[PDB]
RNA sequence: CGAUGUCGGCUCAUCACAUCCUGGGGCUGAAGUAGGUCCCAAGGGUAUGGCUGUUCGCCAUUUAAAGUGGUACGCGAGCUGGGUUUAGAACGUCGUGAGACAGUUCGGUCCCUAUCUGCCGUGGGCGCUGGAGAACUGAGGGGGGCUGCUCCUAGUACGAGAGGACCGGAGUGGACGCAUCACUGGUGUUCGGGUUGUCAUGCCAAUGGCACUGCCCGGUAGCUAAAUGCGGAAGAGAUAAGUGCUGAAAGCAUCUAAGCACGAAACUUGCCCCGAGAUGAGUUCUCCCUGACCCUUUAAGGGUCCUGAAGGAACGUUGAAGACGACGACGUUGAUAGGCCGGGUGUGUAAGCGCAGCGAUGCGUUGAGCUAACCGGUACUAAUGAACCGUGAGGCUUAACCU
RNA sequence: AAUUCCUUGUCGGGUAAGUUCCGACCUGCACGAAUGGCGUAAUGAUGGCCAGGCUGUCUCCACCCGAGACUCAGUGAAAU
RNA sequence: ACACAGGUGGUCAGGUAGAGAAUACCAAGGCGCUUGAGAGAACUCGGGUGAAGGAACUAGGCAAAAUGGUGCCGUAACUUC
RNA sequence: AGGACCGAACCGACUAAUGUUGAAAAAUUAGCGGAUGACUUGUGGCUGGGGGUGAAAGGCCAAUCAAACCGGGAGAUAGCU
């Protein structure tokens, strides 16, 4: 239920090989307000696909 | 496995799920737009949009059904007196989902849900 | 779908007399033995009806010789030859499974007259 | 759908009233027995003076099951009593001569043509 | 001999005259369209490559649509390839009807099965439950023991364990063809072919004579 | 002996063959039926219960058979704790006694979240010498391999009868496996009804909350087996044991030494699936790309600007796909999902009102109302203009052409 | 026999089948009378056995409801 | 040892059903037990249902299931009555 | 009337599952026993280590008991590791 050796720190790098994060690829620039937001998400000012959708 | 199934479990038992959407749908209509998580928002559509479907026919029976779905007289009023004639010519699709990014405290995907003709 | 239903509609027997649960009914089925298509009768109480169009079926219960015999006919099958309602009845529940233990006096159902 | 330790009922004037299945025949590891099948049974209870007796070990043929038989149309003929007809261990043919209650069309053969002849009702 | 590509419509039953209820499986087979003929001289083996169905014209890729335009045929939802037997040849743009099966008596149907997810050993390899009572601690459905003490001191290749079940290619052999409704492009086969409704099927004639 | 923690059972096995069944033979004091023994043969198959802790044993009743062993008398970081094996207690026995008895009996705590190997799955990365998208070949690898019974041959061969075949064929079962949900059913805490208590909606009515889903009765989809389809082959080749032909050595004989034939569930095929990370990295088809420059220790080089393709991925709607990833469908040109409409199914005649009835209730309106996952429709909502990645013709050496 | 080594004693009952049980037998290895003998109604979270009833204990498992497992965010151990 | 499913003496005693301080729903009153969000695989825990059979399981009916109230009727061997 | 019956609180602790680096250095859950008595409990008090106490099991005597804990002789001794 437990190791018999100390696993080398070279293994620990190899175990963390897939643990890298992932940057957000595309940021939709809003065509009206000009501010950048997540594609298919609303802006930080209540715009979505040009038009104002929610007065925050 | 869950082949061809429907509904969500939402990490809640069934009496809590039904009681939560009852409290939520009434809280929607009282404000016409609320902020909630995305899987709760995608599931609320399968409650409120039949209530608005029921809102298109002001019988005394549908008064008694919609009160049995919500248990709130004010919501029963606002459905038939206002939302009835408001959405009176829409073939479904009475609400809209707008995603406002993620929640601060627990990284939950929040989304606004609103009615279509709120503006 | 539109193809399956197109194949069921060309094998449904249109001449099925409609009925309800609790209807005392008599059914003539073909029985082949040797080269003899005799037409055996069978008569009892409809206790359950399963409706699916072509695959629709119903269950008939009788008390033969002190024994309860349930028999479930596929409705549109060509082995059934005639279905004839003898006595309609006024039951309320859609499937009469409580007639698997009521016998004699309690097995009676009152006649629908509407 | 008869397996071992199954109480059955007796369907003739052989003399028993209550038997119990102890072996399904016709193949190794054979779990279940429907109609038209030969099983070995004991006799739990008989009339005070019958052709058989409490404790006899002999064959039987199953005529009525609760799970019922099926037919090439998809129909199904259930019953209420898992009932059987006793047989000789050697000539493999019935003992009593007055079959009680109905039987089915699957029972008929050159093997059991006598039983359907004595039966009041062949479904 | 060559086969045909079909889609599983669903299961129903066909009564005969004699009251026999045959549970058939409705496979539609549309006009299979040959795309390419392989042979010895260029490819080492005689086989055809067929397609079926139709597809959105603004979906098919320029590599893929270029392959259909080489054949000069309408783009289908996928390609399949069938090994020719000898003395059995076709042109490129030749279509194929379901009337190929008009004289066969048994067929063989290959489809991707349903996928039961990540299945335990009880469901997958048909193990036995252990004793569900009499003191069973935490082990009501486990596979029990998997090996031996030390002398083959490992676990063998192909030991039946848990895991993926289904969602894979299978073939049910010698199914009985019932009716070739060539006019509305149907095929009626006795018994249940694999896979969900609407999945793709590969239907060949009987391999065992 | 700074712990290799144990009998039997269970669950999974796996191997051997000294073969239990099935297959093939030889001989028989083998008529036939049956055996008997020996040889080949491990492919698959190889009970259920009663007894007792059992191993073992005995018995019942089947089966074609109820093989023998190995694997720490296979398997406790998988279960069990009956046996043995602690502390309690008691009997018999022994001992003056404490106590002791491979004597008995009642009672008696079984830990561990997996690092590596192993394995079952499923990905990421990179390679495959321009890139991309599909389709394959099959180097290999796995799986599969059981058998009864009836009838025909035929009461034939046989046999004094009793009895009773070979061979060949047909049919039908058992067991097992794969698939599937049309049938039969199960489940169906999301659909529907009934009903108890109680509380609440002002009250009545109607609902609703809670009481294991309050308790029930049914039940759609899906999932399922007990439900029902399919499978095990045939054949080929080469053989084992064995049977031979020809045939010398050795004027003969001889199955072998040359040659030749046959010969089994075994072998290799044939069947199924995986299968080019088969690094030897395969094949086919389609598609895409035809910029300028500087720089040096000229290279399959360094940098700059230009250019960004095919396509890909992200995102989003999603799935009979799924732990996650993956896979698949779809993103307005759009039925992808939800809603909606229609159907269908199930429940079984709502509410309200009228009537009857002292009333409970009944009747009418009414196969009503409600109706989850289904079906067929519908852009009503949500699937964004995009952006991002991937580029600029693909080293060298010979060879064959071609000019 | 809570005691019998042989011993699964024998016989009877019970079961299709009983190393258990119950009843006889006495061959008491090695019972036996206040380290009590033999009975004994009642009583017992007592021991053994049988029957009925009931049932996923089982053939033979299926499905569902939750809580975990699992993914994401925050925190963040342990023996070895 | 902890903002720990434990322990801790006394006093108070609402309504309906109910014998009841049982238990259920409630009152006064007090909370929602200090990571969540999704997903809806194996497997485990805690539960619900079951065709046909009904102890065949197993050391052993362990556990589950089942029984259950009141009133009336009726009630065996045996017995220290 | 009762070391009476049933059964809550209370007091227990037979079976079973869980938990076994726990929620917990013995608990939860579901069933179980006693429940007017040899009952149960609160406050205080006494009994001291070969002693106490014990409806007796070598039990219990501050999570420790075929001889408590703490200091001392004491750096006991160790033919052993
Ligand atoms: Mg070490
Ligand atoms: Mg990681
Ligand atoms: Mg869906
Ligand atoms: Mg799937
Ligand atoms: Mg088992
Ligand atoms: Mg444990
Ligand atoms: Mg358990
Ligand atoms: Mg081990
Ligand atoms: Mg090794
Ligand atoms: Mg040692
Ligand atoms: Mg060591
Ligand atoms: Mg070890
Ligand atoms: Mg050998
Ligand atoms: Mg021989
Ligand atoms: Mg001789
Ligand atoms: Mg072999
Ligand atoms: Mg072979
Ligand atoms: Mg074998
Ligand atoms: Mg046995
Ligand atoms: Mg062995
Ligand atoms: Mg061993
Ligand atoms: Mg052990
Ligand atoms: Mg023990
Ligand atoms: Mg002691
Ligand atoms: Mg002792
Ligand atoms: Mg003495
Ligand atoms: Mg000893
Ligand atoms: Mg990879
Ligand atoms: Mg194989
Ligand atoms: Mg089904
Ligand atoms: Mg269906
Ligand atoms: Mg059903
Ligand atoms: Mg169903
Ligand atoms: Mg109520
Ligand atoms: Mg009222
Ligand atoms: Mg409340
Ligand atoms: Mg509840
Ligand atoms: Mg139901
Ligand atoms: Mg062959
Ligand atoms: Mg040969
Ligand atoms: Mg030879
Ligand atoms: Mg010769
Ligand atoms: Mg010669
Ligand atoms: Mg064979
Ligand atoms: Mg459209
Ligand atoms: Mg829609
Ligand atoms: Mg509709
Ligand atoms: Mg309906
Ligand atoms: Mg009404
Ligand atoms: Mg109602
Ligand atoms: Mg009417
Ligand atoms: Mg539609
Ligand atoms: Mg003895
Ligand atoms: Mg006896
Ligand atoms: Mg003695
Ligand atoms: Mg004396
Ligand atoms: Mg004395
Ligand atoms: Mg004595
Ligand atoms: Mg005494
Ligand atoms: Mg759960
Ligand atoms: Mg807290
Ligand atoms: Mg506390
Ligand atoms: Mg109070
Ligand atoms: Mg907390
Ligand atoms: Mg969560
Ligand atoms: Mg159940
Ligand atoms: Mg149900
Ligand atoms: Mg059941
Ligand atoms: Mg039943
Ligand atoms: Mg028994
Ligand atoms: Mg057993
Ligand atoms: Mg037993
Ligand atoms: Mg036992
Ligand atoms: Mg119990
Ligand atoms: Mg219970
Ligand atoms: Mg008392
Ligand atoms: Mg308890
Ligand atoms: Mg009491
Ligand atoms: Mg002191
Ligand atoms: Mg202590
Ligand atoms: Mg002392
Ligand atoms: Mg001392
Ligand atoms: Mg000291
Ligand atoms: Mg010292």
Q: Which domain holds residue D19?
A: 1-123
Task: Assess contact for D60 and D25: CB atoms under 8 A.
Answer: no
Nucleotides of chain G touched by protein CB (<7 A): 15-17, 56-68, 72-73, 79-80
Q: Does B4 touch chain E (CB under 8 A)?
A: no
Residues 6 or more apart whose CB falls under 8 angstroms from that of E188 comprise E14, E24, E25, E26, E27, E177, E178, E179, E180, E181
Q: Give chain E's radius of gyration (CA, Å).
A: 23
Residues 6 or more apart whose CB falls under 8 angstroms from that of C9 comprise none
How far is ligand 79, taken at its centre, from the CA of residue E126, in Å? 69
Q: Please list the helix, strand and coil fractions of chain C in percent, rounded to the nearest 5, in that order.
A: 10, 45, 45
How far is ligand 76, taken at its centre, from the CA of residue E191, in Å? 72
Closest by CA position to B99, among listed E87, A39, E165: A39
Task: Assess contact for B110 and B41: CB atoms under 8 A.
Answer: no
Residues on chain C touching E16 (C-beta within 8 angstroms): 78
Q: How far apart are CA D113 and CA D61, in angstroms?
A: 13
Q: Which domain holds residue C58?
A: 1-114
Closest by CA position to E50, among listed E114, E98, E115: E98
Place of tokens 């199904």: D76
Task: DSSP for A10-49, please give it.
Answer: HHHHHHTTS--------EEEPTTT--EEETTS--SSSBSS
Name the helix (H) or strand (E) containing C47: strand C36-50
Cα dist from A25 to A17, A22, A28, whole Å: 21, 9, 10
Q: How far apart are CA C89 and CA E203, in angstroms?
A: 52
Closest by CA position to D32, among listed D64, D1, D63, D75: D1
Nucleotide with minimal C1' distance from the CA of E35 is F285
Task: Assess contact for D37 and D62: CB atoms under 8 A.
Answer: yes
Q: Decide: residue E51, CB within 10 A, 0-12 exposed, 13-18 middle, 19+ buried.
A: buried
CB of D4 nearer than 7 A to strand H: yes
Protein CA B16 to sugar C1' H22 (Å)? 29
Name the token pair of C52: 């699916």
Helix (H, G, I), strand (E, B) or coil at D26: coil
CA atoms within 13 A on the CB side of C78: 13
The DSSP code for B82 is: I
Q: Do chains C and A touch (3 or more CB pairs under 8 A)?
A: no
CA atoms within 13 A on the CB side of C18: 2
CB of E1 nearer than 7 A to strand F: no
Pick the ligand that lies closest to the CA of residue B16: 37
β-bridge partners, E5: E202
Closest by CA position to D68, among listed D97, D92, D104: D104
Task: Assess contact for D76 and D57: CB atoms under 8 A.
Answer: no
Whose CA is nearest the C1' atom of nucleotide F377?
A: C2
β-bridge partners, C69: C62
Task: Assess contact for C43 and C86: CB atoms under 8 A.
Answer: yes
Helix (H, G, I), strand (E, B) or coil at D98: coil
> Chain B residue with minimal CA distance to A41?
B99
Q: Does D105 touch chain C (CB under 8 A)?
A: yes
Q: How far apart are CA D82 and CA B68, in angstroms?
A: 49
Question: Strands D9-10, D83-86: parallel, antiparallel or unpaired by DSSP?
Answer: parallel
How far is ligand 28, taken at its centre, from the CA of residue D57, in Å? 68
Task: Assess contact for E48 and E2: CB atoms under 8 A.
Answer: yes
Rounded to whole angstroms, the maximal C-alpha distance in chain D is 45
CATH number, domain of D29, equals 2.40.150.20
Residues on chain A touching B114 (C-beta within 8 angstroms): 54
Residues on chain C touching D68 (C-beta within 8 angstroms): 70
Helix (H, G, I), strand (E, B) or coil at D120: coil
Q: How far apart are CA B53 and CA B79, in angstroms?
A: 10
Technique behind this structure? cryo-EM
Neighbours of A50 (CB within 10 A): 10
Cα D54 to its chain centre, rounded Å, is: 17
Cα dist from C15 to B106, C7, C20, C81, whole Å: 65, 18, 16, 11
Name the helix (H) or strand (E) containing E131: none
Residues 6 or more apart whose CB falls under 8 angstroms from that of E192 comprise E11, E23, E25, E172
Place of tokens 């003395």: E87
Whose CA is nearest the C1' atom of nucleotide F274?
A: E169
The DSSP code for D67 is: S
Q: How far apart are CA E191 and CA E21, in angstroms?
A: 11
Domain count, chain E: 1
The DSSP code for C111 is: P
> Chain A residue with minimal CA distance to B116?
A53
Backbone angles phi, psi at A10, to 5 degrees: -70, -30
CA atoms within 13 A on the CB side of E77: 12
Q: How far apart are CA B103 and CA B38, in angstroms?
A: 11
Cα E185 to its chain centre, rounded Å, is: 19
Could you tell me which chains touch chain C, where touching means 3 or more CB pairs under 8 A? Answer: D, E
Name the helix (H) or strand (E) containing D15: none
Q: Which domain holds residue E111?
A: 1-209
CB of D40 nearer than 7 A to strand F: yes
Residue window 33-72, chain C: list those with CB within 8 Å of chain D. 33, 42, 57, 64-72
Name the helix (H) or strand (E) containing B17: helix B14-31
Q: How far apart are CA D29 and CA D33, in angstroms?
A: 12
Task: Assess contact for D2 and D39: CB atoms under 8 A.
Answer: yes
Q: Decide: residue E97, CB within 10 A, 0-12 exposed, 13-18 middle, 19+ buried.
A: middle
Name the token pair of E132: 């569900």
Closest by CA position to D17, among listed D87, D86, D79, D93: D86
The verdict on a CB contact (< 8 Å) between D72 and E15 is: no
Q: How far apart are CA B25 and CA D8, in angstroms?
A: 59
**Length of chain C (residues):** 114
Backbone angles phi, psi at D12, to 5 degrees: -150, -175
């Amino acid at each position: 239920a437990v190791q018999q050796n100390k696993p080398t720190r070279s293994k620990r790098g190899m175990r963390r090989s897939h643990d890298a994060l992932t940057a957000v690829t595309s940021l939709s620039v809003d065509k009206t307000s000009g501010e950048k937001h997540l594609r298919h998400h609303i802006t930080a000012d209540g715009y979505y696909r040009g038009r104002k959708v929610i007065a925050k | 496995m869950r082949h061809r199934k429907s509904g969500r479990q939402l990490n809640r038992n069934s009496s809590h799920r039904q009681a939560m959407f009852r409290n939520m749908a009434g809280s929607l209509v009282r404000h016409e737009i609320i902020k909630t998580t995305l899987p709760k928002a995608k599931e609320l559509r399968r409650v409120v949009e039949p209530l608005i479907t029921l809102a298109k026919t002001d019988s005394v029976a549908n008064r008694r059904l919609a009160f049995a779905r919500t248990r709130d007289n004010e919501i029963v009023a606002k459905l038939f007196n206002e939302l009835g004639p408001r959405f009176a010519s829409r073939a479904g699709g009475y609400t809209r989902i707008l995603k406002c990014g993620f929640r601060a405290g627990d990284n939950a995907p929040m989304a606004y849900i609103e009615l279509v003709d709120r503006s | 779908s539109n193809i399956i239903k197109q194949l069921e509609q060309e094998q449904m027997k249109q001449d099925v007399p409609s009925f309800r649960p609790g209807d005392t009914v008599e059914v003539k089925v073909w029985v082949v033995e040797g080269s003899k298509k005799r037409l055996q009768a069978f008569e009892g109480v409809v206790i359950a009806i399963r409706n699916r169009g072509l695959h629709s079926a119903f269950t008939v219960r009788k008390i033969s010789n002190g024994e309860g015999v349930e028999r479930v006919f596929q409705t549109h099958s060509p082995v059934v030859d005639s279905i004839s309602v003898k006595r309609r009845g006024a039951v309320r529940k859609a499937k009469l499974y409580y007639l698997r233990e009521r016998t004699g006096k309690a097995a009676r159902i009152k006649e629908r007259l509407n | 759908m008869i397996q071992e330790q199954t109480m059955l009922n007796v369907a003739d004037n052989s003399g028993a009233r209550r038997v119990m299945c102890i072996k399904v025949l016709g193949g190794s590891h054979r779990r279940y027995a429907g109609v038209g099948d030969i099983i070995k049974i004991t006799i739990k209870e008989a009339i005070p003076r019958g052709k058989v007796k409490k404790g006899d070990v002999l064959k039987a043929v199953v005529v009525r099951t609760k799970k019922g038989v099926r037919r090439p149309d998809g129909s199904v003929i259930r019953f209420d009593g898992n009932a059987c007809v006793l047989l000789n261990n050697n000539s493999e043919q019935p003992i009593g001569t007055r079959i009680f209650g109905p039987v089915t069309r699957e029972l008929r053969s050159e093997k059991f043509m006598k039983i359907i002849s004595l039966a009041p009702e062949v479904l | 001999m060559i086969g045909l590509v079909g889609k599983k419509v669903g299961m129903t039953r066909i009564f005969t005259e004699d009251g026999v209820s045959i549970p058939v499986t409705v496979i539609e087979v549309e006009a299979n369209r040959v795309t390419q003929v392989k042979d010895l001289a260029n490819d080492g083996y005689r086989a055809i490559q067929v397609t079926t169905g139709a597809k959105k014209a603004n979906r098919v890729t320029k590599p893929e649509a270029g392959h259909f335009a080489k054949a000069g045929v309408e783009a289908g939802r996928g390609l399949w390839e069938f090994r020719l037997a000898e003395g059995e040849e076709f042109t490129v743009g030749q279509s194929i009807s379901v009337e190929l099966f008009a004289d066969v008596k048994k067929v063989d149907v290959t489809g991707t099965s349903k996928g039961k997810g990540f299945a335990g050993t009880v469901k997958r390899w048909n193990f036995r439950t252990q004793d569900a009572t009499h003191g069973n601690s935490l082990s009501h459905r486990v596979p029990g023991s998997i090996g031996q003490n030390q002398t083959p001191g490992k676990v063998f290749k192909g030991k039946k364990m848990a895991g993926q079940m289904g969602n894979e290619r299978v073939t049910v052999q010698s199914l009985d063809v019932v009716r070739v409704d060539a006019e509305r492009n149907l095929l009626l086969v006795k018994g249940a072919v694999p896979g969900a409704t609407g999945s793709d099927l590969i239907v060949k004639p009987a391999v065992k004579a």
